[PDB]
Design a protein around this ligand. Sequence first.
Ligand code: HEM
Length: 324
Amino acid sequence: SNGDLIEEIQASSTSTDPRTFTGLSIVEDIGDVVPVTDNASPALPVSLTDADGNDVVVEDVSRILPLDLYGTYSKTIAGLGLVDNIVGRTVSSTEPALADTEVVTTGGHTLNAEAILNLHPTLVIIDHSIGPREVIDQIRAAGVATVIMSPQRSIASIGDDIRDIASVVGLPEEGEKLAERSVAEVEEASTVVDELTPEDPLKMVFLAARGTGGVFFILGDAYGGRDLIEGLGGVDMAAEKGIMDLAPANAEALAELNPDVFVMMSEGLVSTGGIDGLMERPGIAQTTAGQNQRVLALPDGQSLAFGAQTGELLLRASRELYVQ
Ligand code: HEM
């Protein structure tokens, strides 16, 4: 599907200065993960010690709930061959295959125990990027095999995070194939990013926006803002300022960070009123990025998911950032 995207990248002139670009650039949804197999056959049972130290036996993966903040696990499970086993999702797993699949979070990202248990899951794969913890404890006590992950969520660890998921569902060979394919795709995209990156990198921040009120934050280290921005050839000003979790995107913060580009989730930007609404927020219009109305909007459920589609995300995003 990249045949025409790559022709546009090769065609960009060498004189092109990305600091002169203005306005929104949006990456369209990348879609479903291409599975590495059509006939996955989980080798079960598996016993493991999960990231919280719990001993878990996985003996039935017919009804999976792969749940997290970022949208990673549902995509990896589909990449391994088990998309048809997914029986519920969070709001972050926006991929088309799951669009008719029951949502088990409420009010954004809150786990709902009743919704989960009414789906009669046989395996929950989850991490503490969403909660409450108490709901995770309740479904385990009710009898649902629950596996806590703690993925490294860096570009360098995309492959190991995939291998860890594959080991939970008894598909090590599919895991090795999907890991290697996903890391090769990143490396290929990184060479395009390097060829497109200006000599002085663009300053970026990841701006989280949900609604027209106070859900308006600079995302820090813990969410993976830095890993994405550096993967795009940028400098993450949140990382420069030592933001480990998040910081309010108020006028003082924005003035101090002074990015050249705001990186945002697409539906997040819509929810604050689009570019016009974002430009009304205090401090935005005064930054370099605001003066150029320069926003890179990425599909919400891929933007911080990393995983299998990272390379495609970096390729499309670097074309939007650096190619006119
Ligand atoms: C910090 C407080 C946050 C609140 C109160 C919040 C709330 C919400 C709400 C209410 C939605 C529903 C949007 C819709 O139905 O279209 C949503 C969607 C979403 N959120 Fe959050 N969120 C927060 C943080 C985050 C963070 C840190 C991430 C990082 C991955 C994230 C990722 C997503 C994604 C991927 C979606 C799906 C948007 C879509 O439907 O396309 N959220 N959030």
